[PDB]
Amino acid sequence: SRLLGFDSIPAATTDTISLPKGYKSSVLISWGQPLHKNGPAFDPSGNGTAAAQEVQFGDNNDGMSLFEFPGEKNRALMAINNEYTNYRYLYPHGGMPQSAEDVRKALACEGVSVIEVQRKNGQWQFVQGSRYNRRIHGNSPLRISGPAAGHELMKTSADKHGKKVLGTFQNCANGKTPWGTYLTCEENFTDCFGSSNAQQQFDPAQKRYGVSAASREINWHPFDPRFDMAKNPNELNRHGWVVEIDPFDPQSTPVKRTALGRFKHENAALAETDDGRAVVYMGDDERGEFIYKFVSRDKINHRNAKANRDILDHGTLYVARFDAGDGNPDHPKGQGQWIELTHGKNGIDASSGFADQAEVLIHARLAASVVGATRMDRPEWIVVSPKDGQVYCTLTNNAKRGEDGQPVGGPNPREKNVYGQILRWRTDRDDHASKTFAWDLFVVAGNPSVHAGTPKGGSSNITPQNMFNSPDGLGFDKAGRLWILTDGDSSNAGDFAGMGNNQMLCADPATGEIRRFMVGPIGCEVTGISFSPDQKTLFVGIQHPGENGGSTFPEHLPNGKPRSSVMAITREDGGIVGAHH
Ligand SMILES: [Ca+2]
Ligand SMILES: [Ca+2]
Ligand SMILES: [Ca+2]
Ligand SMILES: [Cl-]
Question: Thylakoid as a keyword (predicted)?
Fold first, then answer.
């Protein structure tokens, strides 16, 4: 490859970062780092307070973007999501929350961390005390905008007007807009809700979004009734949105953009139509859920950033249907289409349960079912090639593919899918306004050391020396390398024998060639990617090292506590990451 300048590295099982020859890594920032001057130091005993966590780097860092600093090449801002927390490490008791303060502490761990970084020499470093440093967390005051703002379903006892919401939490991945703002995506928000009525009978929309009385081992509701569906059921509707943040204004109020629909959002991939409108491609990460596309009403003003303030409040929401393809076992291909989710179109009307457009957005999953969207194998990140505009989406896995309602076919070609695949599409005429596209599976992950000559062996661009499972994160660099980040089974055994720890790979989109670039430490997933403007530093997240015990990364103190960290990857020779030497 012209694009792949390093030799594929072996799989690894060590509690370290493994890289190719001539590459190094350094910790940029870890969970618990105080952001402000004189801020409270990280307390490895777990006795840090909730109020301290509200001014410290959050836990389980995930999606992130870097923003150039106008007029200053040695400064940048990064906005970094904090998805969830690890109770075994968060609290001194190592278990479920025991109090209102424990719940506040968990909420404080989630949201976004905005930080300044500076280069000074050739190395990017965190600037504690920068005026731009900020936490947005699960108890931060936010606003709601777009077509669902002010709707009855968005009103609660504490917010009678349906326009002011506390918190963004379960922040998964990201988008970066061409008007200088950051998008953060609320994914597994429903996990945080429960009920003080164990026999609560949930309605169809509540059931479709997966809420339970017990919560998914989160257990905030016994201590903060905002999360108790017996008392505040509409709170459930005020989360599951894309949230827009201005990193250059630390006093700004983030805004939930209801025009982009409510679902378990993974990331938000930006593009632009030929007539100049914003496009946002979005995955809903759950087994058998859908892929969406928002197109703005108005054109992007590239030279007047502020003129775009509310561009994401007006537009059209679509969902994808994919055909069955040609059935090729190695490289299936076909066509697909975008179908509009608008009240009064495609069977979405009072006769299918929708009174108005706000309900369509709040209950986007149900509207998408009405129109016949294709059930997918867990869409996670989406990226748009900066070289040719093709769109790439991980389908991480789907253990229930083949069950009633989830038939095998097209871009989901295997029952009981434990490995995943990467889907690509090319919008017709290379115009992102097009309502049709050609799709293909760019790779089908598998294990050819265990399942050679079968569907479980993967596509022919997978070999025993580059194999991986559960691709999740994706990123393009300016050169057009496609970076693939994994969140899979790290047992290195059975179906996953020889795959080792979670990892990052690099692909050439034009040829399908994939090489392993990085292996992470024990119990982590590899997630979050950004580049310095000069492409000589690759920032990558190591999330939940030691989730099951067994890590002390990065500090490696005796019987130590592991900490989610953002790493800076560089070449010893100072060249571009991924490129030839
Ligand atoms: Ca993910
Ligand atoms: Ca994942
Ligand atoms: Ca994960
Ligand atoms: Cl572990």
Answer: no
**E strand map for 139-189:** 141-145, 164-166, 171-176, 182-186
Is 380 assigned a ligand-binding role in the annotation?
yes
∠ at Cα 111 (191, 228), nearest 5°? 35
Report the separation in Å between the CA atom of 169 and the middle of ligand 2, taken as the mean of its atom positions: 17
Nearest-angstrom CA–CA distance, 81 and 185: 9
Residue 55 buriedness (CB in 10 A; 0-12 / 13-18 / 19+): middle
Structure-determination technique: X-ray
Residue 152 annotated in ligand binding? no
266 is in an annotated binding site: yes
Whether the upstream peptide bond of residue 70 has omega within 30° of 0, thus cis, is: no
Buried b (16+ CB within 10 A) or exposed e, 1-34: eebbbbebbebbeebbbbbbeebebebbbbbbbb
Q: Per-residue b/e over 62-87, b at no fewer than 16 CB within 10 Å?
A: bbbbbbebeeeeebbbbbbbbbbbbb
Q: How far from 281 is each of 269, 321, 342, CA to CA, in Å?
A: 5, 14, 17
Q: What is the domain extent for residue 446?
A: 1-581
Instruction: Single out the residue of 519, 561, 558 nearest to residue 544, CA to CA.
Output: 561
Distance, in Å, from the CA atom of 125 to the CA atom of 28, rounded to the nearest integer, reads 6
Residue 240 CA to ligand 1 center (angstroms) comes to 15
Look at residue 402 and give its three-state secondary structure: coil
Q: What single DSSP character describes residue 49?
A: -
Pairing of strands 255-257, 141-145: parallel
Look at the chain and report how many structural domains it folds into.
1
Counts for the chain of helices (H) and strands (E), in that order: 6, 30
Query: Which residues hold their Cβ within 5 A of ligand 4, which is an ion?
Result: 522-523, 546, 548, 550
Expressed in Å, this structure's resolution amounts to: 1.2
Task: Note the ligand closest to the C-alpha atom of 420.
Answer: 2
Torsion of CA 43, 44, 47, 51, to 10 degrees: 40
User: Which of 425, 374, 416, 424 lies closest to 397, judged by CA?
Assistant: 416
Tokens at 283, concatenated: 């995955």
Residue 274 has which token pair?
A: 């030929």
Question: 121 CA distance to ligand 1 centroid (A)?
Answer: 33
Q: With b meaning 16 or more CB within 10 Å and e meaning fewer, what string describes 274-312?
A: eeebbbbbbbbbbbbbbbbbbbbeeebeeeebeebeebb
Q: How many other CB atoms are found less than 10 A from the CB of residue 205?
A: 18
Q: Is 101 annotated as a binding residue?
A: no
| Other residues' Cβ atoms within 10 Å of the Cβ of residue 321 | 18
Ligand 1 geometric centre to CA of 422 (Å): 14
